[PDB]
Amino acid sequence: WVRYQECAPATLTFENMAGVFMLVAGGIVAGIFLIFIEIAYKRH
Amino acid sequence: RSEIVDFSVPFVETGISVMVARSNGTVSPSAFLEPYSPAVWVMMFVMCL
């Protein structure tokens, strides 16, 4: 009636990744702009 | 003893207990090499691709 009934440091989940991931995505948009600028410069 | 004598309120507890030496230095489990959540690893792979 009492004993029979029976049912660690935190792990980075989406706090570290959010900042890092936003950086990677932010670079990708800038990279797309850079290539368009680079191709435009190479056009002339 | 309580049948022939008359005891009193137990002022100290006792019983047939078990003594076990404590396991010094708990070892990190096999899955201790993953601090990142499973969603963490999947997101990293997708970003790499």
Side-chain angles (χ1 to χ4, degrees), chain A residues 1-3 5-19 21-32 35 39-40 43, chain B residues 1-4 7-8 10-31 33-42 44-49:
Chain A
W1 285 113
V2 161
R3 251 184 272 155
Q5 281 70 341
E6 309 286 295
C7 280
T11 83
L12 282 81
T13 41
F14 226 85
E15 65 275 8
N16 159 270
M17 287 204 126
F21 280 157
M22 92 165 188
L23 176 34
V24 173
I28 213 184
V29 302
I32 219 173
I35 184 158
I39 186 190
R43 267 173 179 183
Chain B
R1 285 174 208 180
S2 195
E3 161 143 20
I4 64 137
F7 282 81
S8 86
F11 65 96
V12 163
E13 291 66 350
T14 207
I16 291 155
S17 151
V18 178
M19 171 150 66
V20 164
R22 45 204 328 166
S23 154
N24 160 45
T26 281
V27 312
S28 45
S30 307
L33 72 87
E34 323 258 358
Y36 273 161
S37 153
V40 193
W41 293 101
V42 154
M44 161 285 268
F45 140 79
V46 75
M47 269 314 158
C48 179
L49 259 302

